[PDB]
């Protein structure tokens, strides 16, 4: 497919005398994919995320989304097709009721009230939020605010969903629920989603890892090939999954298991067949 997002020779400094944050970022994005930008804190990836939507003014390079190249005159046109969810789930609301928040996007783009209610109702019912429509905003669960923001961005009907960090502030159950909801949305409406991440689960579901360190592309591979770097994966920016836990633990205790990445089922079958034979 034609590369939806084209980025090359991106170097920028949000402070004039600070060390190079991003330096010559060069990568491409196809349609209907799931990327992953992982790196240790201080390397700088949130800057990349903010630049991708034309928020911070950069000088060197050029980014193109949907054919249009980014200039400080077409940014409003670009932002129509770009949507993102920010880090803190308590600093993204604009209204006094959930309905007002989900409507905000539609109101911003000149549209008529008579057509509004069906669309906001469908959006709210498309994420299982209908029963909390009328209540105040500072009463929902932490992840429910993220779900409401997701409902609004679904209502605006974009093509690219820049999933900036949105899974650190929540608890395990909320994280699982949000991952399931975004899975469903991607499967239905064919949305390309980028993700800044530290948790394993979201990276696992993705199709391309784009490790970034010190403002440089150091690696790029498939999830399977990148979940094999032992302890240094901890420094990478992720947490080793349980399979890797047991993998590493067995080595120190004088037993050598296989090499390639394996899920729960593969290790289960391997150990069962190896031991049950004897």
């Amino acid at each position: 497919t034609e590369n939806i997002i084209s980025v090359d020779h991106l170097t920028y400094q949000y402070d004039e005398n600070q060390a190079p944050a991003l330096t010559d970022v060069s990568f491409t994005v196809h349609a209907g994919e799931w990327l992953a930008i992982v790196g240790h804190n201080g390397s700088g990836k949130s800057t990349l995320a903010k630049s991708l939507d034309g928020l911070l003014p950069f000088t060197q390079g050029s980014v193109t989304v949907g054919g249009i190249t980014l200039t400080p005159e077409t940014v409003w046109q670009v932002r129509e097709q770009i949507g993102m969810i920010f880090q803190n789930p308590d600093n993204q609301f604009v209204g006094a009721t959930v309905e007002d928040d989900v409507a905000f996007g539609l109101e911003n783009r000149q549209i008529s009230r008579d057509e509004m209610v069906p669309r906001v109702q469908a959006a709210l019912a498309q994420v299982g939020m209908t029963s909390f429509a009328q209540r105040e905003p500072s009463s929902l669960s932490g992840g429910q605010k993220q779900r409401v923001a997701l409902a609004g961005i679904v209502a605006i009907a974009p093509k690219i969903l820049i999933l900036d960090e949105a899974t650190s502030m929540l608890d395990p159950q909320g994280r699982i629920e949000m991952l399931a909801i975004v899975r469903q949305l991607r499967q239905q409406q064919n949305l390309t989603v980028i993700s800044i991440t530290h948790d394993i689960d979201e990276a696992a579901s993705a199709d391309r890892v784009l490790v970034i360190d010190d403002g440089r592309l150091v690696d790029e591979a498939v999830p399977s090939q990148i979940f094999e770097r032992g302890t240094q994966l901890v420094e990478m920016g992720l947490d080793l999954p349980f399979t890797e836990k047991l993998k590493a633990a067995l080595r120190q205790r004088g037993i050598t298991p296989p090499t390639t990445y394996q899920t729960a089922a593969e290790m289960e079958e391997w150990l069962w067949q190896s031991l049950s034979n004897t």
């Binding site: 939507d53 928020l55 409003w76 932002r79 129509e80 949507g83 993102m84 920010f86 803190n88 600093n91 993204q92 604009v94 007002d100 409507a103 905000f104 996007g105 109101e107 911003n108 783009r109 000149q110 549209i111 008529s112 009230r113 509004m116």
Partner: peptide, 22 residues
């Protein structure tokens, strides 16, 4: 943070905007 998030949505200026709560 709220200002950045709102700008991302496309809040260009005022008076060019419909009304919902009537």
């Amino acid at each position: 943070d709220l200002s950045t998030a709102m700008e991302a949505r496309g809040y260009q200026d005022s008076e060019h905007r419909s009304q919902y709560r009537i």
